[PDB]
């Protein structure tokens, strides 16, 4: 059961790595969307100019 548990926990560790990768991906996506919104706001300000 020592070896069985170690292999299972290896699987768990790689699973955690994948989950963190997805989290940082979504964070980058939200950052990009914020940048796009502020760009549109700047465009409207320039239009009013």
């Amino acid at each position: 059961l020592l070896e069985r548990l170690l292999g299972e926990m290896e699987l768990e560790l790689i699973e955690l790595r994948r989950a963190l990768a997805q989290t940082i991906a979504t964070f980058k996506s939200t950052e990009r969307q914020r940048d796009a919104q502020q760009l549109i706001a700047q465009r409207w300000y320039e239009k009013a100019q």
Binding site: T26, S29, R32, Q33, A36, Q37, I40
Partner: protein, 49 residues
């Protein structure tokens, strides 16, 4: 006889209008808008991938 001729003179126009609307709708699910970020548009799904 004349009534049937009249109906046949419009079936084609109605089919064309239906097909144009179907294709126009099928456009949006692929690209949509650049700031869509919905994970439904096929380009954002590739971007996050």
């Amino acid at each position: 006889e004349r009534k049937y001729l009249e109906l046949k003179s419009q079936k084609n126009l109605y089919l064309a209008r239906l097909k144009s609307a179907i294709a126009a709708q099928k456009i949006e699910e692929i690209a949509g808008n650049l700031d869509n970020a919905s994970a439904s548009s096929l380009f954002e799904r590739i971007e996050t991938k």
